[PDB]
Design a protein around this nucleic acid. Structure first.
Lengths: 83, 121, 129, 207, 223
RNA sequence: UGUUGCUGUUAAAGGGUUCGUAGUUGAAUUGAGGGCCUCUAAGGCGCAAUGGUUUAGUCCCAUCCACUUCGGAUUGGUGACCC
């Protein structure tokens, strides 16, 4: 990940986050891009401490693509189950 | 006449932090206020205490608006009580549930099916 | 009317990849459109696709990733030679790193790197980033 | 669940409640946001909301609220009288903070102020009253959970739970459920027994 | 200096050694609203300020006019930080201060790459970009080693402070309005992390926000 | 002065409308082969077979509670699933 030399030494200041909805990038001047955390659960119905995470981005939220995103991600993990 | 915002502001703070009054007497209220506050005007003390009374009278009815949610709390603590015993979700089911067509349809196709005490009009 | 079939594909694909769509429909079809996608699909710009039959003129469908930024056609289909390429790469592409220009050469439809390697020139076709 | 234990899935009692108290009865009106969650309608044109997908969203919501390190990074917002009790009551069980009454712009975006808050989660109750709050969460990176009807704008609402919100009963029952299923997962009020607090605490009572 | 007492979750975490760089900030994309956070995490004698523009502004009223000064200030570091800000005051020294403060809350990181063979350290932007503010627009173009900054006076400062060496440039619009010229060139630089290249994509493992991690602290602080 | 590379609602500029010759431009189609031999070759949601003791979970049996809202057991069956 990121730019290298021919010595393999990484020269990027930092490597930014993805959007997992649309595979974009999450800029420092965008304040509308967020991170949600859904706690994983064992048998009996208790918490084991969080695993799964989503990332959504600026572009989506103001066009109201939000809900549609979070469905189409959660279904892929098996968090949400379609009847 | 019209009361300045010094008056109003002050008075609100008291109604909040004390329910060592609830009285609709100007008189009773006043003698609380003057030993709780330092303002060094006797004029101000009159107007403050007067307004106080005209908050407590409103408080005995619906929402006063713009004076915390503590009102709900001490209003709930009264009588009675609260109101049963077994209720409400109990009564509701047990006396029949009635429902229109579309709902009943959708329910019986679920993996829990149409449950006990439901339902047709 | 409908003139260029090719640019009626690559304009659709481009726009849709902005607008957040994960699939596109492309209503006319050609023996050109197919090939142009096959290229891209190697690298990872295009994920899969289908080709539907109607027995008059086909339809096509496209999948998407997010790894494509823009694609298009360079309409009059100008000419290029073995030194010439560096003109086009300095122009249409933003850099001499990650872009590609697409050409129709004597050998077949290819992308600029491949061209230079095998030492053919040829006409030009489109680009993708 | 992952390696399914077949808890957190509807049982008889669940259905019974949600039918009775009219949480499946929506508005006549529609919007392109809500058309997935709509399921048929009547001759009144009253849209009827799916039970199954309400429940799924509802579960998901709880798993957010009880992920949090400290409950006080959740806020619960409403403006409407019928809900303005059940805010309080919900918050008092779970341990969350809340914001009641009209929403003051300058409570999330103002640097230095009497009321300044920075919650990591949010809840509205309608996005069509609470609108102002949504706006301010755009700029502070706050994800928003919302109850909805068969209308609702979803702009700056990450998670949408279709509900009714048109009467005392409707708002109450949703908060009652959420309080239950957060406690079950975290700090173990058990799900062997029925829960012991009764609904009517949450219910609005007229003056 | 007169002292700092933080009013933010962010600010607390900075004022003790937990967040030790601005790239943690930049990642999770949290806003900076206390100028002291940029002061704390960037070493002194490595910040370069200066004023691009100071300019009068009027308004009309009964009897005469009313006058207010104004100023632009630019700040940053050659490792890839820069910001800009402009503000207003009814005296001179006011507007000066207020600019500088503003500027240190619009810090944004800047990405650099190569034109050709990958040797040494990056001296040039990885790609072409654009910015537009007003009519006036600006375009930044990669260039090879030793090509140097070929630009007008106004842009050349922006670039030099960023840590971009070799470049080229070009503009359209009225370039003689200086406030818009500045802001254009700034918006240009920003978009080098706004564009997605084969250098990256890999779907990296994501991490929790400092607030979550250090939550222990922030609870005690409330009490 | 704009081929690369401009502008035309209001800053200078779409000609009152239509037909129409020279000129410029113009949809799809004959079609891109397999076989065999290996290499840690990346995958099969295809299949036989041994291993699961709550040492995975879920169906179908058993039994007692139970009007919403109970769980112990027969590696139940290598239905299913890891490995």
């Amino acid at each position: 990940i990121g730019t290298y030399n021919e010595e393999g030494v990484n020269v990027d200041l930092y490597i930014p986050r993805k959007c997992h909805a649309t595979n974009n990038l999450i800029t420092s001047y965008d304040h509308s891009a967020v991170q949600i955390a859904i706690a994983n659960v064992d048998a009996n119905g208790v918490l084991n401490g969080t695993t799964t995470t989503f990332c959504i981005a600026g572009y989506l939220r103001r066009q109201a693509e939000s809900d549609h995103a979070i469905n189409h991600l959660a279904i892929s993990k098996g968090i949400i189950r379609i009847k | 006449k019209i009361r300045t915002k010094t008056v109003k502001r002050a008075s609100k703070q008291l109604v909040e932090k004390y329910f060592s009054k609830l009285n609709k007497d100007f008189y009773q209220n006043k003698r609380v206020v003057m030993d709780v506050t330092i303002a060094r005007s006797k004029k101000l003390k009159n107007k403050i205490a007067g307004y106080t009374t005209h908050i407590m009278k409103r408080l005995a009815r619906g929402p006063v608006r713009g004076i915390s949610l503590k009102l709900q709390e001490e209003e709930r603590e009264r009588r009675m009580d609260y109101v049963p015993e077994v209720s409400h979700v109990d009564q509701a089911i047990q006396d029949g549930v009635h429902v229109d067509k579309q709902t009943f349809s959708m329910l019986k196709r679920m993996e829990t099916g149409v449950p006990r005490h439901v339902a047709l009009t | 009317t409908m003139m260029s079939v090719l640019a009626n594909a690559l304009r659709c694909i481009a726009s849709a990849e902005r607008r957040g769509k994960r699939q596109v429909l492309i209503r006319p079809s050609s023996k050109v459109v197919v090939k142009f996608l096959q290229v891209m699909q190697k690298h990872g710009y295009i994920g899969e696709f289908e080709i539907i039959d109607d027995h008059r003129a086909g339809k096509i469908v496209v999948n998407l990733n997010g790894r494509l930024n823009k694609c298009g056609a360079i309409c009059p289909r100008f000419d290029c030679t073995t030194p010439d390429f560096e003109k086009w790469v300095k122009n249409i592409l933003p850099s001499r790193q990650f872009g590609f220009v697409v050409l129709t050469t004597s050998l077949g439809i290819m992308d600029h790197e491949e061209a230079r390697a095998r030492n053919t020139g040829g006409k030009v076709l489109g680009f993708f980033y | 669940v992952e390696s399914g234990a077949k808890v957190l899935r509807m049982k008889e009692g669940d259905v019974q409640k949600l039918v009775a108290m009219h949480c499946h009865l929506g508005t006549k009106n529609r919007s392109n946001a809500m058309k997935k969650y709509i399921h048929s309608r009547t001759k009144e044109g009253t849209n009827i909301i799916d039970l199954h997908m309400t429940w799924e969203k509802l579960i998901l919501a709880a798993r957010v609220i009880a992920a949090v390190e400290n409950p006080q990074d959740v806020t619960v917002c409403s403006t409407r009288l019928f809900g303005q009790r059940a805010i309080f009551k919900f918050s008092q069980l779970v341990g969350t903070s809340f914001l009641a009454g009209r929403f003051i712009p300058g409570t999330f975006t103002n640097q230095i102020q009497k009321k300044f808050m920075q919650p990591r989660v949010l809840l509205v109750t309608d996005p069509r009253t609470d609108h102002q709050a949504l706006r301010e969460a755009s700029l502070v990176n706050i994800p928003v959970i919302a109850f909805c009807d068969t209308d609702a704008p979803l702009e700056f609402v990450d998670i949408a739970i279709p509900c009714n919100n048109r009467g005392r009963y409707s708002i109450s029952m949703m908060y009652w459920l959420l309080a239950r299923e957060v406690l079950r997962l975290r700090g173990t009020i058990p799900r062997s027994v029925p829960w012991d607090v009764k609904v009517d605490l949450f219910f609005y009572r007229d003056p | 200096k007169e002292e700092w007492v933080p009013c933010t979750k962010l600010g607390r975490l900075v004022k003790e050694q937990k967040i030790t760089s601005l790239e943690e900030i930049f990642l999770f994309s949290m806003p900076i609203k206390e100028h002291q956070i940029v002061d704390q995490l960037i070493k002194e004698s490595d910040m370069r300020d200066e004023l691009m523009l100071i300019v009068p502004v009027q308004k009309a009223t009964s009897a005469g006019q009313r006058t207010r000064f104004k100023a632009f200030n630019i700040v940053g570091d050659g490792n890839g930080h820069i910001g800009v800000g402009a503000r207003v005051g009814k005296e001179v020294s006011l507007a000066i201060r207020a600019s500088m403060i503003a500027a240190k809350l619009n810090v944004v990181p800047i990405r650099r790459g190569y034109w050709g063979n990958k040797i040494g350290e990056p001296h040039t932007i990885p790609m072409k970009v654009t910015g537009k503010c007003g009519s006036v627009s600006v375009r930044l173009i990669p260039a090879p080693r030793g090509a140097g900054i070929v630009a007008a006076p106004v842009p050349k400062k922006i670039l030099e402070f960023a840590g971009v060496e070799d470049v080229y440039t070009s503009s359209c619009g009225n370039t003689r309005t200086r406030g818009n010229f500045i802001m254009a060139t700034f918006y240009a630089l920003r978009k080098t992390y706004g564009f997605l290249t084969p250098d990256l994509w890999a779907e990296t493992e994501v991490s929790r926000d400092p607030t979550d991690e250090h939550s222990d602290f922030l609870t005690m602080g409330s009490k």
